[PDB]
Amino acid sequence: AIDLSRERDPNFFDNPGIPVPECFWFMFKNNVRQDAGTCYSSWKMDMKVGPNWVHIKSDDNCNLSGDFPPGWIVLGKKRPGF
């Protein structure tokens, strides 16, 4: 059921004093979208995914990895023009 090509863009705000994050991320529980936001490529972030904090890494093409709790996933995609 998960197809990022059909997912609406997140609500975001790019802080003007730091570089613009290159990725959108999308968080699902049992393939239902829970929320979404932005993050840097080739980087890392700590995010509460359901009950647990997860250290999520991003590669240069916004593919995200991390040890997600059962039923949960976070997926990335390159923003327009990046």
Partner 1 sequence: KQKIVIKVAMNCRSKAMALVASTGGVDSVALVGDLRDKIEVVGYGIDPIKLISALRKKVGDAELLQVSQANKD
The owner of tokens 């700590």 is 46
Identify which of residues 43 and 72 has a Cβ nearer to partner 1 in the complex: 43
Identify which of residues 48 and 70 has a Cβ nearer to partner 1 in the complex: 48
The contact set with partner 1 (CB under 8 A) reads 10-13, 15-19, 21, 33-37, 40, 42-43, 45-48
Q: Shortest approach of partner 1 to residue 70 CB, angstroms? A: 19
Q: Shortest approach of partner 1 to residue 30 CB, angstroms? A: 16
Those residues whose C-beta lies under 8 Å from the C-beta of residue 68, and which sit 6 or more positions away, are 49, 54, 74
Strand ranges (DSSP E) for 1-82? 23-29, 32-39, 43-49, 52-58, 64-65, 72-78
